[PDB]
Design a protein around this ligand. Structure first.
Ligand SMILES: CC(=O)OP(=O)(O)OC[C@H]1O[C@@H](n2cnc3c(N)ncnc32)[C@H](O)[C@@H]1O
Ligand SMILES: CC(=O)OP(=O)(O)OC[C@H]1O[C@@H](n2cnc3c(N)ncnc32)[C@H](O)[C@@H]1O
Ligand SMILES: CC(=O)OP(=O)(O)OC[C@H]1O[C@@H](n2cnc3c(N)ncnc32)[C@H](O)[C@@H]1O
Ligand SMILES: [Mg+2]
Ligand SMILES: [Mg+2]
Ligand SMILES: [Mg+2]
Lengths: 627, 627, 627
């Protein structure tokens, strides 16, 4: 019933939207006709978008294959994404506009204008530059959500040194593996972070990792908690001590890099035992994050924007830092969690900063639904004009709860589908589309999405199949670091199209619904995990011979992990062992990837080539639906 | 599941039914074949029915168009419906049969034979006649459900003076508007009525209305409560004081009117800000109410019949007064409500009068379901042989509750579909049809119902569409008073067919299901309201600039009204204001039309011609289903 | 959702299964292809199976019609089923293997090897032989589930004297009617049995029955309770007193009977007022019970097998005694009920005997589900490797409960469809088939099952129809005792096929689902009852003129019986009368057939030939689904 209902947009949004203005300028009033034009005229569209940014040197060609399926956008353009986030606003009124509204776990707070971020980034860039960081060097970042995280990312960008951010919830093995895969040369971290009134010991974990990372030449430490932490002479140095000798008027000019020079690497979990470094580049990634931010979230000059995702994930890269800053938004940056000091924290933040756009995750919404409708009703949320969700299916009851309690039964919900590999939102409503609960809606301009069978034939309306995209888009990953074969499988699993690894349906009006992954990827509480990487993290333990990890449905977390463990012969299979195996995973990989359930078995299903048939494991537990 | 089950009729009803006997006399045993004959031979059918009543002069032609789409039945026949309800039973045994079993709110009671109603109607007709009432004059009636209401209606009928009954739950503006639209010359009312042990102040409300009704020359007041009420010298006079000088043997002969002379006007809420006076005429209306009563409720000489509807609505006109009296039934007339003194009141009444047929509303059933299965089980209900429901969809759980607790899992439920405009039941079971929960079943004889799209093409089994009727029937309204353009839209929205304004489905066996109105009509607790009339009743208030009224689903009431109100700039939008706006509506229009929910907004959706797009308002709140 | 899920078999069962080995030996690895071969080569299949047993003389022809639709299998073969259950294991290691693990109601217990059962059966055969029992004589058996029941059955078999077992829950009229229909010559019974710590007075009931059974020449009484019971001189004699004079080395050789000589009669309830004696014969019945037991339950040398059914029903004949003993299994025999002394009794038994295969009824599972997941978790059930259910639909929630709590989310559930008339399982999983909850899966080898309309046309995937079998199978009944016309209706209701009297569906993969009986059969708590036999048991009472019995859905019992009773005129219809009528049924027929609900009516629906239209009775109560 409820999923098949259409909700028309509120008053005043359609006539005023950014998408409407761009549509008009090309002669359209209807999204469907404009969309069809966008397929036939994709270069014109992306040229128009690219022209709204600053280029050091113009491009020759919008798009081209290099060695299919590798490609490029804005060939020979010289660019720096950091110039479009900072420098180009200097000497204009935007310099005094707030860029980041920082909000600490404990309720402390501080606002940073574009000018202040410009100055702070310049000075951090100088510190990195004096240590020997230069274009092409990888800079690892393991930080809590504080202004110096944002400044470190943009400082790397202005130097042309690709950043490699590791989410602060990962433990030492996870951190070590990511820095060794990409050969990071320096690490930027903090003494610690706060989550729910407790200290997270980032520096201690960083030590455990850096001891087994031979390329790390220096560790820079933000003094955030102020606790006494160990500091190796020579290697480890406090940022504030170095910044003391860097004047307030210091300028490091942006490095004019090629549009195809690396911006960052972000490790994502996949179908192998090792995470894959997705590589994004300055030019096309900037243009895509810019355009999607502008049209989906309808950014205007007076908007305060808040995306609740951590910067350690793609959503925080694209839609907390780069896309919003390129639209000159005022951006909320929050260090803490939804439930501390109490479960109305998000609604305090919205009221305090008069947030206009909130982009959050269903995991947060399902969490807060448990605490009742009274909590958000205690705050003034009338500043909100657009809501958004990302990362997983939002079930209809949560969508209704969101729209009712946070949106006063009026506000649109932008349910955005995309992935780390895609760089930008690809399938999503805009403010002009009528909404269906649980649907990501129609593709964005130029995005040629479809649902096909294993051979590439359209399955037609209302049938399930594989979600594919038929033509590159500017923000797509350009390679997987050190592993181009892994990149090619994305375009060569189904001939000539990009394979998302998601099941989907398209209904009679063209609205897409994403069912979930067709491979070994498991989403727990919003976080992407790989079955085979979890298995590895258990097989490392002396007690364990083999392991199979599956996802099981969970009301709060979406999925939880269960692992079937074969122990070495003779090992007594106890509750104490289960606790110990969970600790092993929690202290090496991190809490986010700790199994909730473990079961000890004496055999597992295997193909003849020795691989674990995970589908059979899951089917034995849960059954397999026919088709 | 449950809605798709077929329940065969009980023991002994099929062989004994009135419909079976009429079928046999034309050579049929199967309803489906008889029905098809009834379509090809509709004039024969209606002639047969008309011949069972008394005519002063016979008709020339069964049916004819005058100026299509106006038409007539029994042309040039001279008739009086009151003669078939009263006079023709005098000098026969039916004169001493009970006609009305009156039951007061407080449990007092009195039985009136056909002879006693004959005498009482004659005497009230004389009072009206001495005041100057004559054929064609409109007589307003605002009364509680007491015997003098029935006698006033039939007295008007015998004089040929169309009656205009205003339901006693309406307040002064509603009463004033109805009397001014039709230029009523006298008003018949009461000092007050009782509902749930409380006095309803009818005379006080009548004063407020009559002060702004310039055509009212006289107000006749029944002394029902006996409370001291104001009485303007000259205008207002007590009925009992006038009847004191009217002897017991007084006779006013029936006026032999044309079959097409006005019988009554009944204001119904529609798609405009003003209610519409549906005009019914003596001859075809009598014949239709007669035949439907006979076949659907299977009236026999020993039956006590009870329809729980108020006479202020069409159901009380057709199926409390005229149809039952023309079948010579003994009829229950109840002043009160289902829950006073306790929620077993209806079942006390059934047991007390050994009711054989009960025709009630789903609103009553849903109300009583709340109080448990114990209440009806405390009474002997074994006198019942037929149950009936009208006015709204009965959901399957309520149908089961009805059939189980009131019908001992045996009795048929006649789920009758019709409307004020149709005069008589059109789609309904008879005792010979197997029943489906929530289905109005097959059309009655001669009724050519179908489900079509906007152009008039059949949609075929199992698909939703517009319910239409293809050929007039005798009891249909002949016009809308003072507004023939409004009448014509009924036949010219879809070419050449009558458009009900209801959505419906027809299943594989021909059984119809009515989903609900496709226009701006809202049913609250059984009562028909118009969105645009509710809006008017708010816009009259100084605080309010504009309003949009929508229906929302409600478990007890079926729908409830919510109104979106735009206030004049500067008006503080408070809870006190909401209470005050509800009072404004309650004290002018009446409780039945008071909004349950009010929300203050600053804008509403409009077409370019300035009209309120109510569908968009509702869709924003509830969503719109696709199709 | 849940019913459409496929659950693949666990680890190690497919490669080791008996069915896999037989398949391989004919050149197959896939069940579907093997199944098709089994249809084209049914005689080869059944010859292969028959060769695994001992024959005194070989057969000439696998199958032939005699007078279609009567037929025979293994024509002219000389055989004795008891030789394949006992004698042929003597002088081999199987002689010292446990045959029966007997477990008393009170927790007492005793194990009997194949040798001990051989000796005990021989000695009981001698007692029967000395009394004058010989080939063709009918021996009635009314016993509790004790070792002497098993020995009495096999002793009859070795003498060639057909047994007629009457379930110990039946009362005297039921017992008398079964013995008079087949002219039983002796009765074997007990002083009493125990159920839930209470004595069931079998001997007292046997007296009431034998007084009206003129052919009974002798009653043999097992001393089980040891209570003082009446003993008529001449007729009634204690078994233990006779066995005292029968030496331990006594041998009665098996009678080499024709493959088509009667093995037993088992009365089953049908569509007439009298139960029907289904006749099974030694040869084909042995071969079918042998093969189905081997392949469905995958019996191996180390298996302990437990079927919870009473031997008084077909499931206990085929799958407690004959099929298991012919596979040389160790078999659990339990006297008691699931809930005494507590509702973990079944799980105590599994743990105590390390049961490997459990074959039980949904009635037991639905019963135990009421007591929570804690009870089975208190016992070690890890010995189980196969679960099974029979006799009625198992709803998905019960299937899940079974698989989760008893099967640790791994074990296959063999949902077996068959009937008394079929002798053996016909539609069922084997260990190699992926399972669907609530589905009986695919037909077993050579069984040509299909779903057809009333004329015999296939209805095709996903449509409901009549379940039929197209070609005989070895264990099918050969006749109905004294009533060959009743047998012929099974093959002549739908031309040329066997009509099961069940509705069914076949899905896209060929998996069958059995909805239920299309006739007047009612299953209550696993027990097959006939509407018309229940009616008879009420009409016998002086108060009652007529009766109609229907089945109504019941959460615990599956169905319960409600009876509509017409009383003689003048009889006061009271609660005391209802109690008395239930007692009448309980004390003559038995508790298993006592109505839960009785309603007194004054008329019932009848055809013109005077028969009760039960479908109309049920439809009036519950509705009839359309189709
Ligand atoms: C941005 C992000 O989440 O990136 P990433 O961590 O790489 O995960 C990507 C996978 O997330 C799932 N997913 C993302 N957005 C979704 C949405 N709106 N509706 C349903 N499923 C959604 C799919 O399964 C994707 O393939
Ligand atoms: C007699 C009366 O109610 O007249 P009225 O007040 O004019 O209302 C008429 C409207 O009522 C609804 N309606 C009436 N009977 C119904 C029924 N049996 N099943 C479902 N809906 C039913 C439809 O929506 C009609 O068009
Ligand atoms: C063995 C036995 O029960 O014999 P019997 O007492 O003669 O009853 C036979 C009737 O039982 C029902 N039935 C048996 N097994 C079933 C199963 N697995 N699924 C669904 N219904 C099943 C059908 O209705 C049969 O026709
Ligand atoms: Mg290991
Ligand atoms: Mg106003
Ligand atoms: Mg009798």
């Amino acid at each position: 019933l409820i999923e098949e209902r259409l909700f028309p947009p509120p008053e005043d949004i359609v006539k005023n939207a950014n998408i409407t203005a761009y549509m008009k300028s090309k002669g359209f009033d209807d999204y469907e006709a404009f969309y069809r034009w966008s397929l036939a005229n994709r270069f014109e569209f992306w040229n128009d978008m690219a022209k709204e940014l600053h280029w050091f040197e113009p491009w020759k060609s919008t798009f081209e294959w290099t060695d299919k399926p590798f490609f490029k956008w804005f060939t020979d353009g010289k660019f720096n994404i950091a110039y479009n986030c900072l420098d180009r606003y200097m000497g204009t009124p935007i310099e005094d506009k707030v860029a980041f509204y920082w909000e600490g776990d404990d309720g402390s707070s501080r606002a940073y204008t574009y000018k202040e971020m410009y100055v702070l980034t310049n000075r951090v860039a100088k510190v990195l530059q004096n240590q020997g960081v230069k274009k092409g060097d990888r800079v690892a970042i393991y930080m809590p959500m504080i202004p110096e995280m944002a400044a470190s990312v943009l400082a790397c960008a202005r130097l042309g040194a690709p950043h490699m951010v590791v989410f602060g919830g990962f433990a030492a093995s996870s951190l070590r593996d990511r820095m060794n895969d990409c050969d990071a040369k320096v690490l930027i971290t903090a003494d610690g972070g706060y989550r729910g009134g407790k200290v997270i010991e980032l520096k201690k974990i960083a030590d455990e990792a850096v001891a087994e990372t031979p390329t790390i030449e220096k560790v820079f430490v933000q003094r955030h908690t102020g606790f006494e932490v160990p500091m190796a002479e020579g290697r480890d140095v406090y940022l504030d001590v170095l910044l003391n000798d860097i004047p307030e008027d210091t300028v490091v000019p942006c490095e004019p890099v090629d549009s195809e020079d690396m911006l960052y690497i972000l490790y994502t979990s996949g179908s192998t035992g090792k995470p894959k470094g997705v590589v994004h580049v300055h030019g096309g990634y900037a243009v895509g994050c810019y355009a999607t931010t502008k049209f989906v979230f309808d950014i205007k000059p007076s908007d305060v924007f808040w995306c609740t995702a951590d910067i350690g994930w793609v959503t925080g890269h694209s839609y907390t830092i780069y896309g919003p800053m390129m639209n000159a938004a005022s951006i909320v940056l929050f260090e803490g969690i939804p439930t501390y000091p109490a479960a109305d924290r998000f609604w305090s933040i919205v009221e305090k900063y008069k947030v206009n756009i909130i982009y959050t995750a269903p995991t947060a919404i399902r969490s807060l639904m448990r605490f009742g409708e009274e909590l958000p009703a205690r705050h003034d949320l009338s500043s909100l004009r657009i809501l958004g969700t990302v990362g997983e299916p939002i079930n209809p009851e949560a969508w209704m709860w969101y729209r009712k309690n946070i949106g006063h039964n009026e506000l649109p919900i932008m349910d955005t589908w995309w992935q780390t590999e895609t760089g930008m939102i690809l399938i999503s409503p805009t403010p002009i589309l009528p909404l269906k609960p649980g649907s990501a809606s129609r593709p964005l301009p130029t995005i040629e999405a479809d649902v096909v069978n294993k051979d590439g034939k359209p399955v037609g309306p209302e049938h399930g199949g594989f979600l594919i995209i038929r033509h590159p888009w500017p923000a797509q990953m350009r390679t997987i670091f050190g592993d181009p074969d892994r990149y090619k499988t994305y375009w060569e699993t189904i001939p000539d199209v990009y394979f998302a690894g998601d099941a989907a349906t398209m209904d009679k009006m063209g609205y897409f619904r994403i069912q979930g992954r067709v491979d070994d990827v498991i989403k727990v509480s919003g976080h992407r995990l790989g079955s085979m990487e979890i298995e590895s993290s258990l097989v490392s333990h002396p007690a364990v011979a083999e392991a199979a990890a599956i996802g099981k449905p969970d009301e709060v977390k979406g999925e939880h992990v269960k692992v079937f463990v074969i122990l070495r012969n003779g090992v007594e299979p106890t509750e104490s062992l289960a606790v110990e195996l969970k600790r092993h995973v929690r202290t090496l990989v991190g809490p986010l990837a700790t199994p909730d359930e473990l079961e000890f078995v004496t055999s597992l299903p295997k193909t003849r080539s020795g691989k674990i048939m995970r589908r059979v494991v899951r089917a034995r537990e849960l059954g397999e639906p026919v088709g």
